[PDB]
């Protein structure tokens, strides 16, 4: 309970506007919204997983009640503090709360934890809750058509509220409150970080966004809390063993990145579900190896899926369009059908087969492409998510995946490891999917994206993937070139010429602690050795794919890190030149 | 006689990070609230202890309850369970919860400990009575309306985390979740050393090293029971006249010393809680075959050291972060050293391949015992076709799914030659494609053991799609030094007189009735006549044939153990090995 | 008294004058509920009993629930209401064996008690699936209780039973019988004329409603749409 409003709720801006236009603006401007006879809802249910922001949205709506009286009166009740030991005061108090809601006309009643007030009536149910449901239903049916009282109710278990209140004329419009996605977690982490004395760069907030698949806003708040506490611990470890208050300056405590990496393992994943593929941009180490090929792929996907001018039609919220952009100004039906049928005619049948050698970074390229298509809907058809056995056969699971891709356009149907998918998934399932793609209009944005290792091009011209349109849409991943391999190993050689007075490590605390108040050497490494080891690294990894380049990199990084503390890196260069033989 | 109530924090072994975190959250918000205001954060007021039975949860709550009642400022401990909350009247359970929280706010520096909290606060269900969902709702409300200064701490131990309601386990209500694991070898050493601390004749350090090496799978309760039954076996053999006497005979307690044989006898008569209904933990190399394999196994422990960075990273095992911050200074935007440190792990695979036999069950158990921090995932058919109707693929994919979320992990396939014939083609394709969907820096060891596998069809073949390229071990047969050191414990059994055996010797001299209140005939040319042909018989033998020969000769030597003339034992051995 | 026994409180702002494109089923529904209440002298002359059961089946958002609610608010007048019970096959306690039979018997007791009644089952194949199916969770005793509790031949009274479903295949073929569900009505995705009629219904209470030509264009551009 604080003075909390919006601009604190990240990743749910669209829902607030949808709720404001559904709830707040029809209650506020009936001169506008009664012109079209659209009735405001009697009951609106916020449901979702725990920690997803559902009490925040009602608290922010009640700070939107922080306005002048007789407008948007807000009542804040729970699934408790209504129910009592007596037999009447619960139902009498509910009738009275609704009568005071009618008394101030435009009014909202919010029931946080509505499963506490309205559980399922059965024969293990109490009488007093069953009568609370029996009066709340009759009060909701008593509320008039000219809707001026709106009852919002929140639950984290929606099929544990009583079924009666979900019937028409009751709590019938729902808002699902999911766990946040990556940009939503980025905004939430920014929101938690905002008012710190020493700031946090936006790249680290993006990395912490990509590390927390499964984290609600409560989880990200407590992750920041434990990061602050780990930083206070490492900055002043003497305030912990004191039993008396020490004079500590709170300005020298800065929450670093190592504190966040310790708070990541100090925080329980809370149904993270880190399974299968994750859309994630190409990692910084292999980014020299697959940057230009991924750029060619991104340009080919822009031409194919028309992403250069839509980016979901320059819309993710319609409200920001209607204030910044001036519109173009019934003879407009023929014009709008013409320019819409020409805008949808850009998309024919999207199909991309990304072929490559064995172990040429396809698991990185596919994840970076699915990070590039964030505004799409990904339906992964890999083997581990089809044989996950949800009490259905895999034909049914393929068919339902295609249905969900077809419902939520623009979407991708992402098949990684295509040459393994061909031999593993049965032939009639591949023919079912081929029929599902033949029964598709040529104006539907369902990209069929397939990544293969060493797939024989005969199988897509006259084999089982021939009835998939992979005619001119084969991208070949090349093995990376000499410039890419050179820039790949330049970071390794930069790690080599790095002095042991610059490599962070943990030696013993040989100095005493400050015991607070109670209230000049060169790395011996010649440039000819650097040039020779660069030439040997380039000459060894000739026509290497990305995986066998990563192997050479891992081995040489092991060698370099073994002689980490040496000041004369000659037995390092001798080990490295000897290894590449 | 009974269990303690003044246990201090030094009687708890193996959980030092959690002791430091509990001390932090009971002391630091009381003294320095400005640090919780400088950063805009609220100190955590809720902990959930969870772990296997007998691992330290009620012990740490007891130690904290004793620490609450010693110092110059007094923290009030409030102990509850489901019995003294649940009432048979309408609205009386929730009233008792509210009286607890109000009384703890009144005595404001306060701990509230709910033990077996899944029984007090189960997952809310409409197929249960309304009192349990009502108690969960009242608890959620009372936790959401606490003091908001770190004054009332709420600690709960559930033994099973899944049973508790997910609304209570979200940050805001129970912020921290302390996982009390089964102790590893340093923790088991420290626990056993705590148990054998007030003993008059002490235990050594090398023996507790051996004793913590052999007790994998034990909780702290199982190790305390190991010292208890070891001590009672010592009392039993030191003074067995106690057990047939209905009145108190005088004994001398200083004449009782717990022997190594008594501990080794107590190890046989004790099943830990983790194995009391299940299969026991993977054991190390058994003591007889350590000559035949250990040096070869040591080569494996080097090859698995330069491919996983074992000893370099795991030097801090559930240790206190606070003592690491006190003991080691930081150097103090430049986290590409994280990227090169992650770059040392490329995709770690190991195929330990050898002849038919050759102790590969022992080697696999030894390696899985050596990697106790890793999460092993067993893809042998004893577990894949175990829970039936589930399907091998839903088991194999699930097994890979727990191998890529709880990293470091080991995907363990023993009998790989049998596995790639008795496992459906799709599982290998689903597993091979699941492995090549991983990033290269991701610590999932693919450990595979095979007897007489075709190395030409692992470059090609079904295992072509795994990177068994230059990380393929070779378990060659034991060598003559190792076979000779192996059989040189069998010659020691030949050199025992029948008066040297600790076997069942009769009592002629009866019980001391307490105060109430020759030469072995073994020629040294026979003692190498045995050994030269014993080594000559075991030519290019594997580990299994060697221990079969050892078993036969040990039967022959053991049946003539009552005799001092061992010539008729020698010629039977020479006749057998021929 | 403690069960799901509440009447769904209907609004009189839903009638057949707000339904588009389904006039045959409305005319067949007048002789089922409204005319036996209004003209009981004529049904007694042939000693006939009207069909007490009908299965609404069709794709989602085509107006099966709307047809039932308008049926309730059609002959609820002349101080003679139609008590509307609406249940669903997606309830958590619907597959609760032991409890679900008690709830169904109590629902049919309370529907017999408020004599002109309508029971509407929103997803009847969730409640009465095919007993010869291949999922393990199937309660045959629930379906036999639903079979014997509804009876258009045994004179319970003026209780109309309505079931709604997407396709009548998934419903038990024991429930598609002259005693239980006499009639089945297919509620289709509306065609161009019925989409014009629905879009004329959805805009007739505006300030400046759409023109006829504008509505015709909207009906054409909404191919594949239901009324919802």
């Amino acid at each position: 309970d604080m003075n909390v409003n919006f601009d604190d709720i990240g990743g749910l801006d669209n829902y607030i506007d949808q709720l404001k236009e559904m709830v707040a603006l029809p209650l506020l401007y009936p001169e506008l919204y009664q012109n079209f006879n659209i009735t405001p809802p009697r009951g609106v249910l916020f449901h979702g997983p725990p920690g997803t922001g559902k009490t925040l949205m009602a608290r922010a709506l009640a700070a939107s009640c922080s306005s002048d009286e007789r407008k948007i009166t807000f009542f804040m009740r729970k699934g408790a503090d209504i129910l009592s030991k007596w037999v009447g005061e619960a139902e009498r108090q509910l009738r009275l709360l609704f009568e005071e809601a009618k008394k101030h006309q435009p009014s909202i009643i919010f029931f946080d934890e509505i499963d506490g007030l309205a559980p399922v009536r059965s024969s293990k149910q109490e009488q007093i809750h069953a009568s609370i449901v029996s009066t709340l239903l009759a009060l909701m049916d008593g509320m008039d058509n000219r809707g001026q009282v709106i009852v919002i109710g929140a639950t984290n278990r929606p099929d544990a509220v009583d079924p009666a209140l979900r019937r028409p004329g009751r709590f019938d419009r729902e808002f699902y409150f999911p766990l946040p996605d990556v940009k939503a977690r980025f905004k939430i982490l920014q929101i938690q970080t905002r008012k710190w004395s020493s700031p946090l760069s936006t790249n680290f907030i993006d990395k912490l966004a990509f590390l927390t698949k499964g984290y609600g806003g409560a989880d990200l708040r407590s992750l920041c809390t434990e990061a602050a506490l780990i930083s206070i611990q490492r900055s002043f470890p003497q305030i912990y063993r004191s039993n008396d208050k020490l004079l500590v300056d709170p300005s020298k405590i800065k929450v670093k990145v190592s504190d966040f990496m310790l708070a990541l393992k100090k925080i329980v994943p809370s149904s993270a579900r880190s399974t299968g593929s994750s859309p994630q941009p190409l990692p910084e180490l292999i980014k020299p190896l697959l940057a230009d090929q991924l750029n060619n792929l991104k340009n080919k996907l822009d031409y194919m899926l028309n992403i250069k001018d839509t980016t979901f039609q320059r819309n993710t919220s319609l409200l920001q369009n209607f204030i910044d952009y001036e519109e173009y100004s019934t003879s407009s039906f023929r014009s709008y059908e013409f320019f819409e049928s020409m805008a949808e005619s850009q998309i024919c049948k999207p199909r991309l087969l990304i072929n490559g050698p064995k172990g040429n970074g396809q698991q990185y390229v596919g994840a970076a492409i699915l990070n590039y298509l964030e505004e799409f809907n990904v339906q992964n058809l890999d083997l581990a998510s089809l044989v996950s056995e949800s009490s259905r056969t895999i034909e049914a699971a393929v068919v339902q995946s295609f249905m969900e891709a077809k419902k939520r356009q623009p979407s991708v149907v992402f098949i990684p490891n295509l040459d393994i998918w061909i031999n593993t998934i049965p032939e009639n399932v591949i023919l079912v999917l081929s029929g599902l793609f033949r029964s598709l209009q040529s104006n539907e944005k369902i990209l069929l994206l397939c990544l293969a290792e060493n797939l024989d091009i005969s199988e897509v011209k006259n084999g089982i993937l021939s009835d998939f349109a992979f005619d001119k849409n084969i991208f070949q991943l090349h093995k990376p070139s000499k410039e890419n391999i050179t820039r790949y190993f330049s970071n390794l050689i930069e790690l080599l010429k790095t002095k042991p007075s610059d490599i962070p490590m943990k030696k013993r605390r040989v100095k005493p602690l400050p015991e607070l108040q109670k209230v000049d050497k060169e790395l011996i490494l010649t440039p000819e050795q650097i040039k020779k080891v660069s030439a040997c690294l380039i000459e060894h990894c000739q026509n290497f794919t990305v995986s066998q380049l990563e192997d050479v990199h891992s081995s040489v990084a092991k060698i370099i890190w073994k002689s980490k503390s040496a000041w004369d890196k000659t037995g390092t260069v001798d080990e490295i030149i000897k290894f590449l033989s | 006689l009974g269990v303690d109530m003044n246990v201090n924090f030094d009687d708890i072994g193996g959980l030092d990070n959690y002791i430091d975190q509990l001390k932090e959250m009971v002391a630091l918000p009381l003294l320095y609230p400005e640090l919780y205001q400088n950063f805009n954060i609220t100190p955590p007021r809720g902990v959930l202890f969870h772990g296997p039975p007998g691992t330290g949860k009620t012990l740490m709550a007891r130690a904290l309850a004793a620490s609450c009642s010693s110092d110059e400022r007094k923290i009030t401990f409030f102990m509850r369970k489901g019995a003294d909350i649940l009432s048979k009247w309408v609205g009386e359970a929730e009233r008792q919860l509210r009286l607890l929280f109000e009384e703890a706010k009144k005595h404001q520096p306060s701990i509230i400990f709910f033990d077996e909290i899944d029984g007090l606060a189960p997952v809310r269900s409409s197929k249960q009575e309304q009192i349990h969902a009502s108690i969960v709702s009242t608890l959620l409300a009372l936790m959401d309306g606490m003091d908001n200064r770190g004054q009332v701490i709420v600690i709960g131990a559930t033994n099973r985390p899944d049973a508790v309601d997910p609304a209570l386990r979200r940050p805001g209500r129970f912020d921290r979740e302390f996982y009390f694991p089964l102790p590893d070898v340093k923790a088991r050493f420290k626990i056993l050393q705590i148990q054998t601390r007030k003993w008059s004749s002490p235990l050594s350090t090398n023996f507790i090293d051996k004793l913590a090496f052999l007790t994998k799978g034990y909780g702290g309760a199982d190790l305390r029971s190991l010292c208890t039954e070891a001590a009672l076996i010592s009392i039993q053999r030191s003074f067995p006249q106690i057990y047939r006497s209905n009145d108190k005979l005088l004994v001398d307690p200083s004449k009782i010393k717990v022997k190594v044989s008594d501990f080794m006898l107590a190890l046989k008569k004790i099943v830990p809680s983790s194995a009391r209904s299940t299969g026991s933990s993977p054991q190390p190399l058994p003591e007889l075959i350590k000559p035949l394999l250990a040096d070869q196994l040591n080569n494996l422990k080097n090859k698995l050291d330069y491919m996983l960075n074992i000893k370099d990273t795991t030097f801090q095992r559930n240790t206190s972060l606070l003592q690491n911050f006190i003991d080691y200074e930081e150097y103090s935007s430049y986290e590409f050293f994280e990227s090169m440190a992650e770059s040392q792990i490329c995709k770690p695979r190991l195929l330990i391949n050898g002849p038919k036999g050759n102790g590969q069950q022992y080697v696999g158990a030894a390696i899985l015992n050596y990697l106790e921090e890793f999460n092993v995932q067993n893809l042998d058919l004893a577990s894949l076709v175990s829970e039936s109707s589930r399907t091998i693929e839903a088991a194999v994919v699930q097994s890979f799914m727990e191998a890529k979320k709880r990293q470091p992990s080991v995907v363990f396939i023993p009998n790989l030659d049998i596995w790639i014939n008795t496992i459906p083609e799709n599982v290998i394709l689903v597993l091979s494609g699941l492995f090549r969907s991983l990033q290269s820096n991701e610590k999932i060891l693919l450990l595979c053991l095979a007897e007489n596998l075709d190395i030409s069809e692992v470059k090609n073949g079904i295992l072509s799609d795994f990177a068994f390229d230059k990380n393929i071990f070779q378990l060659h047969k034991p060598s003559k030094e190792n076979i000779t050191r192996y059989f040189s414990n069998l010659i020691e059994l030949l050199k025992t007189k029948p008066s040297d055996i600790p076997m069942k010797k009769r009592r002629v001299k009866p019980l001391p009735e307490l105060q109430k209140v020759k030469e072995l005939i073994l020629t040294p040319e026979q003692i190498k006549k045995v050994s030269a042909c014993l080594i000559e018989h075991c030519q290019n033998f594997t580990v299994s044939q060697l221990e079969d020969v050892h078993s036969s000769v040990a039967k022959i030597i053991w049946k003539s153990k009552s005799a001092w003339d061992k010539t008729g034992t020698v010629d039977e051995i020479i006749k057998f090995l021929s | 008294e403690i069960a799901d026994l509440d009447p769904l409180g209907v609004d009189m702002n839903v009638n057949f004058d707000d339904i588009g494109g389904l006039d045959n089923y409305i005319d067949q529904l007048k002789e089922m509920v409204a005319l036996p209440l209004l003209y009981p002298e004529l049904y007694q002359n042939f000693n006939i009993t009207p069909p007490r059961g009908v299965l609404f089946h069709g794709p989602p958002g085509t107006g099966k629930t709307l047809m039932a609610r308008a049926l309730a608010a059609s002959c609820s007048s002349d101080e003679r209401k139609i008590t509307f019970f609406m249940r669903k096959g997606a309830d958590i306690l619907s597959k609760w064996v032991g409890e679900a039979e008690r709830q169904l018997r109590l629902l049919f007791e309370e529907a017999k008690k408020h004599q002109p009644s309508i029971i509407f089952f929103d997803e009847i194949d969730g409640l009465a699936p095919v007993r010869s199916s291949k999922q393990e969770q199937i309660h045959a005793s629930i379906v036999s209780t639903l079979l014997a509790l509804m009876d258009g031949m045994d004179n319970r009274g003026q209780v109309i039973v309505i079931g709604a479903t997407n396709r009548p295949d998934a419903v038990d073929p024991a429930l598609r019988r002259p005693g239980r569900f006499d009639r089945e009505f297919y509620f289709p995705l509306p065609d161009v004329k019925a989409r014009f009629k629905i879009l004329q219904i959805q805009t007739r209470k505006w300030s400046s409603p759409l023109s006829t030509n504008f509505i015709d264009k909207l009906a054409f551009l909404t191919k594949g749409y239901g009324g919802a």
Binding site: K85, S123, Q127 | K88, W89, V90 | V97
Partner: peptide
């Protein structure tokens, strides 16, 4: 799953 319940809360209600 079908199991039954406690005879309902007495509601003493005198104090």
């Amino acid at each position: 799953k079908s199991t039954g319940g406690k005879a309902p809360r007495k509601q003493l209600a005198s104090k």
